[PDB]
């Protein structure tokens, strides 16, 4: 079945420009008339994409090309076909592309669309073939020479049958067929878009977002792919199986996905009608900064510049031990409210998710941290204070509140960061005949400081004569019993109340998570969140040699410069991957496309460390400019650059800088 084709000629590789093609819907969220910013694997605008063509040029030893080479897959592929006679028939994806590994085949064999994930012995020169029969003028599918064997097939889909037009056509290419292929978490994602065209070469400029086509659960590694094309045989192609063939005109183009940040416009029907590639050029940077497709004239420094980050790293001290929260909450006996029981929690990995998701808790109210944000915040001490009170008093356990319980039994600070759980305990903690095992302090001469336990037996003086410590008249014992009964009202029913205080210090992380750590890389512009401190930049091995039991150092501007990861205890240094705050000067997009770039606090000799570098630079004490041209004329300030420098779009027509 495998045949190595001959008679190909040599031709240098060709390239073209992708314009603004290749945008696809990155999710399935229901939208209408909104702009949305997202970092995902996209084809950069105006990329040099590779151009491949199946043709047979007229003349003696005319160029004869049938392009089906192996290509890398990397992080995903944008593919575009310009067709008239349907030469491109599909693809194969894999790593070895032999029976040693599994491979994916997506091929349209003129009767069906076939998708198969199997161990394939693919041919070195795989192809499909159509035969033209002169006598009845019929173009019929004749050859299928993709693989020589298929074993351990694990996925198979065959579409409903059809009969496709296989005729070799005359004229210009008439259909553009675009695909975006991704391999994410074992799922092969296919997005596609079909467009009528009329051209001989290149790609159309019109914008069209690709619509997600299919999501295949195949779970295979993909690093390489090959295009499957259909050739032609007829009485006009004498020769053997290797040489008796010709190529019907067709072209295809390959561009490569990479992590890019796009601003996408969703219209009233949710269709992506336009997009901005933030890192294409400063104008796109301004548009992404202002969250708008239209930007008015002015000077903006917050636009800055981004090479973007590559990957994210999460690190925490490696602790797997389970916390005893379940043991504490499921205990049989507790202390009283005046003797609130305190347990310290340290050296553990947390599981608050199940506690929050539990439906057996009457009141679960938190201050300082939201339950969703709690999983990603990292603590050094946990304090669990447990007691039991009647249901109506539960509302008194809250910051900045008064009442006998708050004043005399348990206090909370006005700057409390922590959360409170309380839930009904009528059956377990109440019984007939009264309960004298839970009491409360009702009478004392002052309030309590926050987090202060007291079990004093000082006899309260309620009259005008000292008791001297002996029970008498108007002489009250400070503690009184609730006397819970199971037949009373809901307000009198006992309730278990616990408070979790998340004590944060400047100390090594102790109990945090639950989230798995990730391998560490350096010398790359990445996102990171060390112990709950989040940043974007490049991590380098630099030494400041600070103190033991220190975690971060700060500059004058109060931004983190040094970090100490837990699993290594290494002194990493943070460097911003930008060139600093760079200012853009614009006269408005709807008026002109020329812009000026001011590198504040930057010399013109550092700029080279899209305008690549200085070509005609004016230097002021405010910085370097590349777009504005000096004139000896003086005019009223229109856009004040600063330091006596003002700019405007004036005479030719260009942005010029002047000094009144």
């Amino acid at each position, epitope marked *: 079945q495998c045949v190595n084709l001959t008679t190909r000629t040599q031709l240098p590789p060709a390239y073209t420009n992708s314009f603004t093609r290749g945008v696809y819907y990155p999710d399935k969220v229901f939208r209408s008339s909104v702009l949305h910013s997202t970092q995902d694997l996209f084809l950069p605008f105006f990329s040099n994409v590779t151009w491949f063509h199946a043709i047979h040029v007229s003349g003696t030893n005319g160029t004869k090309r049938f392009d089906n080479p192996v290509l890398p897959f990397n992080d995903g592929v944008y593919f575009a076909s310009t067709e008239k006679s349907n030469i491109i028939r599909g693809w194969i994806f894999g790593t070895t592309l032999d029976s040693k590994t599994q491979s994916l085949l997506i091929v349209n064999n003129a009767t069906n669309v076939v998708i198969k994930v199997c161990e394939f012995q693919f041919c070195n020169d795989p192809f499909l073939g159509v035969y033209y029969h002169k006598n009845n003028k019929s173009w019929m599918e004749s050859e299928f020479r993709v693989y020589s064997s298929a074993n351990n097939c694990t996925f198979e889909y065959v579409s409903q049958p059809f009969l496709m037009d296989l005729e070799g056509k005359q004229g210009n290419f008439k259909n553009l067929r675009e695909f975006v292929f991704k391999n994410i978490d074992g799922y092969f994602k296919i997005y596609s878009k079909h467009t009528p065209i009329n051209l001989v070469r290149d790609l159309p400029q019109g914008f069209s977002a690709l619509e997600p086509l299919v999501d295949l659960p195949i779970g295979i590694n993909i690093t390489r792919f090959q295009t499957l094309l259909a050739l032609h045989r007829s009485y006009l192609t004498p020769g053997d199986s290797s040489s008796g063939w010709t190529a019907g005109a067709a072209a295809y183009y390959v561009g490569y996905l990479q992590p890019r940040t796009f601003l996408l416009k969703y219209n009233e029907n949710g269709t992506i009608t336009d997009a901005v590639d933030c890192a294409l050029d400063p104008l796109s940077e301004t548009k992404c900064t202002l969250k708008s497709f239209t930007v008015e004239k002015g000077i903006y420094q917050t636009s800055n510049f981004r090479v973007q980050p590559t990957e994210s790293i999460v690190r925490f001290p490696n602790i797997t031990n389970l916390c005893p929260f379940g043991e504490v909450f499921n205990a049989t006996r507790f202390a009283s409210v005046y003797a609130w029981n305190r347990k310290r929690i340290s050296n553990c990995v947390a599981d608050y998710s199940v506690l929050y998701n539990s439906a057996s808790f009457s009141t679960f109210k938190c201050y300082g941290v939201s339950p969703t944000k709690l999983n990603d915040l990292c603590f050094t001490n946990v304090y669990a204070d447990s007691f039991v009170i009647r249901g109506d008093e539960v509302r008194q356990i809250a910051p900045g509140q008064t009442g006998k319980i708050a004043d005399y039994n348990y206090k909370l600070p006005d700057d409390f960061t922590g959360c409170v759980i309380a839930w009904n305990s009528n059956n377990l903690d109440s019984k007939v005949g009264g309960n004298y095992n839970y009491l409360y302090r009702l009478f004392r001469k002052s309030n309590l400081k926050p987090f202060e336990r007291d079990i004093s037996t000082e006899i309260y003086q309620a009259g005008s004569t000292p008791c001297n410590g002996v029970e008498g008249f108007n002489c009250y014992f400070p503690l009184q019993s609730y006397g819970f009964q199971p037949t009373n009202g809901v307000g009198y029913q006992p309730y278990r109340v616990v408070v979790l205080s998340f004590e944060l210090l400047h100390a090594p992380a102790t109990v945090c998570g639950p989230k798995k750590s990730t391998n560490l890389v350096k010398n790359k512009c990445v996102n990171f969140n060390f112990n709950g401190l989040t940043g974007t930049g490049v991590l380098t091995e630099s030494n400041k*040699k*600070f103190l*033991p*039991f220190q975690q971060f150092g700060r500059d004058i501007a109060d931004t983190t410069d040094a970090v100490r990861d837990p699993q290594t205890l290494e002194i990493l240094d943070i460097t911003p991957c930008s060139f600093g705050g760079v200012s853009v000067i614009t006269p408005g997009t709807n008026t002109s496309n020329q812009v000026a770039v001011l590198y504040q606090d930057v010399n013109c000799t550092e700029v080279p460390v899209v305008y690549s570098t200085g070509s005609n630079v004016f230097q002021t004490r405010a910085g370097c400019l590349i777009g504005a041209e000096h004139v000896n004329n003086s005019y009223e300030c229109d856009i004040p650059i600063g330091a006596g420098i003002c700019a405007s779009y004036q005479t030719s027509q260009s942005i010029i800088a002047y000094t009144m």
Partner: antibody, heavy 128, light 109 residues
Framework: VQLVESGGGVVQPGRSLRLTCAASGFIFSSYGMHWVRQAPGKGLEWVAVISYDGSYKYYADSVKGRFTISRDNSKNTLYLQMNSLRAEDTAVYYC??????????????????????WGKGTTVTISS | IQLTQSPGTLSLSPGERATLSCRASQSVSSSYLAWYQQKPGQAPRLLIYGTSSRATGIPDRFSGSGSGTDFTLTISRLEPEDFAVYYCQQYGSSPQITFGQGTRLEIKR
């Protein structure tokens, strides 16, 4: 490399004083600082610590929350405010820099911490 | 954390071995320790850190050993410049580091 202390003298019990420490011969923005005192005819005693930038300042529990430490990197100067001064603090004060020897281990970073250079120090006398 | 020294006082003649002991009330790592000296009316100077290494510019006679909670400083030969007070210090089990009590190492005749 050396350091100098200044501000010592005579103070009534209950007043406030500012001790100053200066350094010369090394980069002042790459190391922390310790204040350690010695009582007359007694052993050494920890007082205070300040990091390189001013984001970590602990204190000894015996003087917890009383003394305040500060530094100015530009002038290469270190200031110590004494508030709520007691009559026990009559002693000698030394300002010193922290240093450590680095060692690599299996996926670890071991530090041998110590103090290397000590100034002549300044005396403080507390009597009514 | 606090430490204790042994002996309370020491008096030996020049040219013999000297041994000082530092004991802990709580387990510490044997790489987190140091030994300093102090002669009267002079700033204290580093002698040993890490119980196994030496500081720059100090002769070989100073040495250290020990682990757990028992630590030992050793001197082979004694010259007139070794006659001063000695301190043992932990500086890695932080905060609130503490020093030793103080040993006088004088001459007996």
């Amino acid at each position: 490399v050396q350091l100098v202390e200044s501000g010592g003298g005579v103070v009534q019990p209950g007043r406030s004083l500012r001790l100053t420490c200066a350094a010369s011969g090394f980069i002042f923005s790459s190391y922390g600082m310790h204040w350690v005192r010695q009582a007359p005819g007694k052993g050494l005693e920890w007082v205070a610590v300040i990091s390189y930038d001013g984001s970590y300042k602990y204190y000894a529990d015996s003087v917890k929350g009383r003394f305040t430490i500060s530094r100015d990197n530009s002038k290469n100067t270190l200031y110590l405010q004494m508030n709520s001064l007691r009559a026990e603090d009559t002693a000698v004060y030394y300002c010193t820099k922290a240093d450590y020897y680095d060692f690599w281990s299996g996926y670890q970073k071991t530090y041998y911490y110590y103090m290397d250079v000590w100034g002549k120090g300044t005396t403080v006398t507390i009597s009514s | 954390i606090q430490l204790t020294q042994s002996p309370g006082t020491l008096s030996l003649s020049p040219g013999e071995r000297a041994t000082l002991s530092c004991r802990a009330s709580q387990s510490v790592s044997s790489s987190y320790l140091a030994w300093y000296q102090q002669k009267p009316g002079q700033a204290p100077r580093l002698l040993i850190y890490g119980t196994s290494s030496r500081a720059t510019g100090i002769p070989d006679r100073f040495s250290g050993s020990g682990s757990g909670t028992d630590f030992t400083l050793t001197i082979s030969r004694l010259e007139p410049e070794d006659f001063a007070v000695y301190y043992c210090q932990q500086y890695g089990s932080s905060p609130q580091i503490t020093f030793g009590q103080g040993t006088r190492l004088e001459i007996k005749r």
